[PDB]
Amino acid sequence: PERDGLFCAKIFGPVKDYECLCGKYKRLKHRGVICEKCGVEVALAKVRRE
Amino acid sequence: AATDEVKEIESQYASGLVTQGEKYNKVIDLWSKANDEVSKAMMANLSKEKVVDREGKEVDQESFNSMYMMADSGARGSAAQIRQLAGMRGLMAKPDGSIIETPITANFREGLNVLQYFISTHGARKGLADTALKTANSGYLTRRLVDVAQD
Amino acid sequence: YSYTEKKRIRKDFSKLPDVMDVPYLLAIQLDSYREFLQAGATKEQFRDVGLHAAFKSVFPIISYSGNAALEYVGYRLGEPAFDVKECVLRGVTFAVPLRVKVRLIIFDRESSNKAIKDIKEQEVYMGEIPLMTENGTFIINGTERVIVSQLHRSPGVFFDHDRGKTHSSGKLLYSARIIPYRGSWLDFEFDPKDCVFVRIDRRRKLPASVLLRALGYSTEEILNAFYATNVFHIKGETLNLELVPQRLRGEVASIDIKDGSGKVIVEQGRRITARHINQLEKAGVSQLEVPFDYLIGRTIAKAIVHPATGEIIAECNTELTLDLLAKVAKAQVVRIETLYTNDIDCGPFISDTLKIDNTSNQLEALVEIYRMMRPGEPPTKEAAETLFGNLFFSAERYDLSAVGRMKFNRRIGRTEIEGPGVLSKEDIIDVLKTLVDIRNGKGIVDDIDHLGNRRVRCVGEMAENQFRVGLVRVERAVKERLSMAESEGLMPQDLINAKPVAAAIKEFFGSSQLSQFMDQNNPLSEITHKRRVSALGPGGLTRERAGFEVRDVHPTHYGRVCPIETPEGPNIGLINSLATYARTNKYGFLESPYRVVKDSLVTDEIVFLSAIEEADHVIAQASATLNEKGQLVDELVAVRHLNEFTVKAPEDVTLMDVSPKQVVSVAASLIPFLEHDDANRALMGSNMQRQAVPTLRADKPLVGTGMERNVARDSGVCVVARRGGVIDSVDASRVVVRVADDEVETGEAGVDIYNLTKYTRSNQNTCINQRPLVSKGDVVARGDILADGPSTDMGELALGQNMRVAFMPWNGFNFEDSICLSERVVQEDRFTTIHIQELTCVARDTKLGPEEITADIPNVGEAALNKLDEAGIVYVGAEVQAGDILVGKVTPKGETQLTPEEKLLRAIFGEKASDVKDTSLRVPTGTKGTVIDVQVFTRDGVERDSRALSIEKMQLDQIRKDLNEEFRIVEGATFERLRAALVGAKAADDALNEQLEKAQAYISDRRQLLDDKFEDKKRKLQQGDDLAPGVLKIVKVYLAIKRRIQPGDKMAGRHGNKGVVSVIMPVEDMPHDANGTPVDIVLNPLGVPSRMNVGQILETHLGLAAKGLGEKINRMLEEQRKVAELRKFLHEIYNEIGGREENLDELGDNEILALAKNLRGGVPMATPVFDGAKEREIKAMLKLADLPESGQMRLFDGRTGNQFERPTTVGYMYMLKLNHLVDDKMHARSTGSYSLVTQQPLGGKAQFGGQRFGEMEVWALEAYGAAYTLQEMLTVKSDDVNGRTKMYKNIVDGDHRMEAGMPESFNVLIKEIRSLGIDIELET
Amino acid sequence: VEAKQKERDALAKAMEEFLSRGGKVQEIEPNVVA
């Protein structure tokens, strides 16, 4: 999915666990960091339900 | 004797003396009178169904057959269920609101005909309707009845 | 005498002789399909209802503001090219085209014979025909689905009481529910305040005067003709009244009617009796004088407009008052039109309904019916008139058959049975006269629980309605497309569209509730699912709409509707069944035949009698004393005349029953001793027999009813013989028979192939197969049984098996109604069953990477790779264990975001980093069996697997083998015919040469016929089938589980005694008699007093007698006696009191040995349902075979060894096997994948979910005073994030702390509540 | 019901009169689209 939509990653979160929308950060360390290309926060797969 | 009596009832109804309601009330209480009469007669011949003697001619006691044992124990069923098995079956009533005047002249041991089984199937389908709707009605009432009493 | 009766004859006990043979069971759907399809007909087809009647009502059309016409002579049926055994294994769903010839005739739009351009051509195939088989079923996309006879309400108007709490009155009239066949549902409700108001679906209540003025009838004429017919005049003594003696009957006259020239009739204050009525009749005085006070209570019919005054002095349908009578007197009115109503006569409710709401104009009724349809819109007269015409008069989206007009004519009274299909205002006049006659009290009210008020439909009428809807949709589309087109500019084929009728015939069988899946687990289910009469579906009453109205029966169902056949659960009463001898009418009415009897003799002809004449005629009983002279010996019999049982005279009756098995359906009639059982447990036993499963060794039933061979004959799984003759060779895959010279044509004499059904899959995942029961070198007859299906043996229905059965509560194993088996049933494999389990795996194509059947699958061990080949499919007949990979399916993946633990465990073992996952399907828990075959479907023009090549090459060599064997048998028949022809006068010569050339032409024609048949088979097996879009290959593997007897299986008999087996108890723990045969399955003696069926004891006594006679004939065959002793043994068997003897006919060498070898395993009985075997013949059969007469055997204790001081009862009970096992219901799940809306587990991860822990479960949990498990089962077992992790860590580490935490259910609730913007905060 | 039957009978009579009054039948192909 893209940004600014029903399944957006900037507003809600990632569709997978510990990944970003553009696919730049795939690690496990950062939990409250924001990417530079996309304005999303990398977190768990349960943060779509928060 | 009750068939001769209901033939007398039909002849005095066709002759033009009484209406339908009087003879209808007459048959729906005299057939039940014959029903509990043959029921207590069934209790009598089920209680006195034993021929034993010890150094004597005759001696009467309780019967040594399984029907009288299950009637006196009363585990599952009652005394009104063996009337369908041995004596007169009873008077199943129509589901519309009336009662059928013709009796059950046969029983389950000798063998019923088509007509008495057709009388019995109406009460059977009515009882199946009550047992099918009663579970849903009891659930529908208890879903609010325990819901108000959860405090 | 059939050939199957020589091997097995049944000892009947019918004291009444059989007067009518059992008719065809599935003939109703057969001739309904023949009427709707019209496959075999002449050039002049029938004018009945069907596809032709639906096409002829629409296909003549006229273009709006133009000139166009479409004519047709008929259609052409398609040829079914798809074989049934190849479409159940390929998925063609029996496709059949249907082409029609349309004649596009143009005109000059001048209503003359000018510019007649006719184009007669054949159109495209309008959809696909279902093309059902002769058995009565059709395949819908792999599976077999059947139709159900919709027992909805009959088309017409009914008038019932319907006393409910909404009326709040003792005597009230219900609403007249006008029920058409399709669309235009109108209502007519009677208001309690002497009024009538019609109703609609979405509109409000409307008066009947507005409805009459919208239909066309004026309010004044309707109010005049509704109440009475009386005119009032002003002549003589200031008034002139027309005296009617019928209206004044029973009315208390409070005034003086002394007119009649000095002759007083009734004085003031005298009640009118029959003497005053006779005095008025003998007088004949039509003019009487009443005072002016009596005219105040009367109501006028029409408006009084005097021509001398020029103004309206009295309104239409208004009451007369003291000033209004003076105005009518001073206006010089000659004739006054008013209604006359009395208290003893009918109440004037129609005038009070017409006088309400000031409805007297046609434009007011038009705008009222426009606001009722489209409220708040532009009120136009033409648009509202067109809407009313399309709703009532026109047939646009409204189809009514002739049976509704026939029922309306039977209700309101008419000499013509056939009526018009379109509704008119005259029918509204008849229904208003009928409702005011019902409100008057004359006549009898209709019963909604009657057989006449519930019509039994079929697939033909609903299919014709759906085809008519699709055809008028296609006609509207063609009229919209050909609006601005021309004759030379457009095309007749391009203007028509076969797509809406194809979509309609798709949704009629795919998404319809009436076309449900056929219960093919048992042949009883197969023959009863056609004969189901359900009230649900479209245009009917559902489960919550039943109530106490349609769940009850009326005694007019004598031989029509069987109430001892309905599925148990949430729906009993509204889903009914069809009786045995009940035959439907041409009008879809349920009728039953009856024997016409005169006052002295008994007639021979039988007439099918309807239900409307049985309420007036007398119906006697066939179970009466007959002295072989055609008269009743008794002077009083239980008869019925006015739909109620009573006593009558033998010289007064006119009709009687044909057979006692005409009232029961085919489900319950297979249970013996129906007259000794109650209908509740007989219904339960019939339901478990309908839900039965076949067995391994089909043992014949001991106590039979006689119709077992009949229900094996009408079943489509059996092999019926078309032509008789000798049998050449018998094989388990196919059988062939020879054709005699009598019933054969000139060319192609011997041609008879019969492909036996191999082990394929049924609908309830059970195996079906055909077993031959004939030999080599025997003659058969027409309709003979060659190979029997599942749960059928040697020509008769043989569902289960039999074993020694006693009635004793033994050690609590048969505790309440439970079962205790023995080791013989597991050591001989008697009641074991084998299920075929399906596993449908797909091989789709994704956008990131395609999938294929590749054997090189990662994460596959040695035990999984040893079973599958280089293709990827396990071989034919391999042992499949629990947790085995069967199909090959590798799916790719990209950007999986793998963890360091996964790459660490991948680098430790040294395996390659495979980015393609393995999503191959496996078996569920508890399935460990052997596969039998695998069916593969590929797309057209795609890569094929080598296993698919092996499957198609095996299928083609099997097809070529059966083609070669049928070519061999037909060339052997031709050579033996030629050899039988040449021996006659061998020693003219031109004839022999001619016959040899004709035989050479015949065998070359057969050779080229098998060549084109092989070409058709190759072009149908090499091509691709229509599958789901996005699928490359569809595989399905058929796994067969060899299930045995396990502790906990379901076991019920035939009289509704449900039970579960306990354990595998050995053969010694059961009590044994002195003969040497210990009892096997011991039952409880509570089934006879509690459940009201004593047929258990009679059936087990006849089973004991039949096993005694079987052991006697077995030791007689062992003792090597002569055939004279065997025929004397059969003579002393077949000469009882009941039934008849059929001895001294069979030959000793062949037929006696055949009946010995086919009756050594038990003998069947033949008992009717209501005049069956009496007890004295059973006492004779018990006493003739060295058995006790009351079943009072003397048994020996196997456990303790003490002698019983009481005689016991043993015998044989023929029980059934159920589809209520443990393996299909077992859910094995410890941890399951949680859901998406909450953290609750569910299926889909190759593991079945748990049960519903709803409201009643947690209510019973907090029924006790506890609180810790209520939150433990709610925050640990489900609805948490880290609570399950910390609790599992506390379980593993050992120490417990019981931290509270925070569940996710509160998070889902606070998100769903804050989605509406609600302030929720915590104080703390 | 009766009106559609009368229209069908009138159309059949008109088609029979057109076929017997000089008109012919144009046999188009079974699979042809404009």
Ligand SMILES: [Zn+2]
């Ligand atoms: Zn990023």
